[PDB]
Design a protein around this ligand. Sequence first.
Ligand SMILES: [Zn+2]
Ligand SMILES: [Zn+2]
Ligand SMILES: [Zn+2]
Ligand SMILES: [Zn+2]
Length: 116
Amino acid sequence: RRRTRCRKCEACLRTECGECHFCKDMKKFGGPGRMKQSCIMRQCIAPVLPHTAVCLVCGEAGKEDTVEEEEGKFNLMLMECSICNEIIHPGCLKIKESEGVVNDELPNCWECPKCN
Ligand SMILES: [Zn+2]
Ligand SMILES: [Zn+2]
Ligand SMILES: [Zn+2]
Ligand SMILES: [Zn+2]
């Protein structure tokens, strides 16, 4: 699934370099604006789900901030499966024979219980 830049990492915060083949193409640098790519120095390190992302079961967004207990917090996070690409709250899925495996390098990312 398509994701958006996090807007908080070194790459996202830094200004466009004005020198790479993509900056040179941008109108703001006097180019024709045909390639339409981002500056090569601004490739987000940890892209996040889009603001419209919701759980495929309950149709709600992340609610991890409303809960303080760690298990409950995790279960109200949106998690996207890296294998089947479903976005869900882990608490909206009950499976006996499997649990999911969280990926710590990307936000809201796991292999869900259906795929693991
Ligand atoms: Zn650039
Ligand atoms: Zn970023
Ligand atoms: Zn849900
Ligand atoms: Zn899955």
